[PDB]
């Protein structure tokens, strides 16, 4: 069994194991701000930011045919301060090719370039979508499981607790090829759950980068915050 | 689509839609006590109690070949007041043949008669096991998915927050034959999750009874409480 794991109760500026891209930034108070926040303390539009763990993770081995089981936990808060226009765009937990750079922003959440399903992406993502695009279901916000496409294969609407901290748990069992995610708002006690079959062996490359990505809207004030307070990850490749 | 749903924020004594069996009892304060509590306020051993919704639910149709998607939510607390011996036995959410009576107590949680896998049971259960029997994994308590057998096909250890209220969400997606359950302890913020493939069409009869069951140990003081504070259920059979 080879393993890998990190666990941040809070974030520390200048930490080497974290790669910040785009607007992504860590405050001295220990919080990770994926998207830009102005001097007046309010969310800026047309912003994209990502954070990747500096070490690649071995998700599966082509030689032995074994695939790893993994689990990730993080807590974040999304604040939508504007009355109008509609807020955007959301944040995602993703896995993909190592040494990747930010893709398209807005509805693409910084991890995709278009709305076409392209196995060439080799990207798996669990999104918390706050804006309804042409490819999205009517309800927002919604949790979505993205496999090589911004058009989720599965979707689950949820109630946003504006400014409140949400706890997320995403788990993958290699034995059943089952990916289950959970969203919990400690404040209200609300619980949301999504699950779906995902063959990691058919989607991702043997080695991947794990990260978080966030993005704000394409027009003035179509924004919200994407703050992350903690993040842990663990993977186990048997053989 | 035919549907059915109930939602109890609290329990009311004398409610007609609830069938109490065994020691099961509802207090005037609105709580459902599955297992007996003595005059000294402490849990009694050798106790078994169950509660079933008085109306059967159509889980699948053999004629159209359609299967229903369902979701159930309930909150409970288990208090293990004795230093010794080890506490037992746990509680379960189950689905099975309509008009059923309590089965064996103790490790069988009141829904099974033996440890043998018998498709004749036609019982599906999500257990919160507090005692480790010969057929259980070493770790207790643990969440377990039971399909026609007390020997879970899947298990997940969890940390008991003695006397604290736990929130549970069990969901079944007919499209993926996926059963995902979640346990959350609001107090500590702990989150546990289990998921597995279950073909309801192959396990349960077209019509079933949904209920909760609890049981205490086979020897003096091998007990704990099994209190339920709320319970809601919803099912949707398309066609
Ligand atoms: O408003 C946030 C929303 O914008 C979409 O892009 C719009 C853009 O805002 C609008 O000014 C222009 O005329 O058309 C674009 C396409 O409809 C983004 O695509 C969406 O993801 C959000 O960011
Ligand atoms: O102690 C709780 C535990 O008891 C098991 O049954 C025991 C019984 O307690 C003991 O006195 C007797 O000698 O042997 C039985 C079988 O090992 C139950 O099976 C278990 O579910 C718990 O209830
Ligand atoms: Ca979107
Ligand atoms: Ca047991
Ligand atoms: Mn979406
Ligand atoms: Mn068990």
UniProtKB/Swiss-Prot annotation, chains A, B:
Say if the entry is tagged with keyword Signal.
yes
Protein keywords? Calcium, Glycoprotein, Lectin, Signal
Sugar-bearing residues? 17, 113
Looking up Gene3D superfamilies in the UniProt record yields: 2.60.120.200
Write out the PTM section of this UniProt entry: A minor C-terminal proteolytic processing site is observed at position 268.
Listed InterPro entries: ConA-like_dom_sf, L-lectin, Lectin_LegA_CS, Lectin_legB_Mn/Ca_BS, Legume_lectin_dom, Leguminous_Lectin
Q: Which family does it belong to?
A: Belongs to the leguminous lectin family.
What does the further note read?
Binds one manganese (or another transition metal) ion and one calcium ion.
Subunit info?
Homodimer.
What does the UniProt function comment say about this protein?
A: Galactose and N-acetyllactosamine specific lectin.
Name of the molecule in the record: Lectin
Organism lineage string: Eukaryota, Viridiplantae, Streptophyta, Embryophyta, Tracheophyta
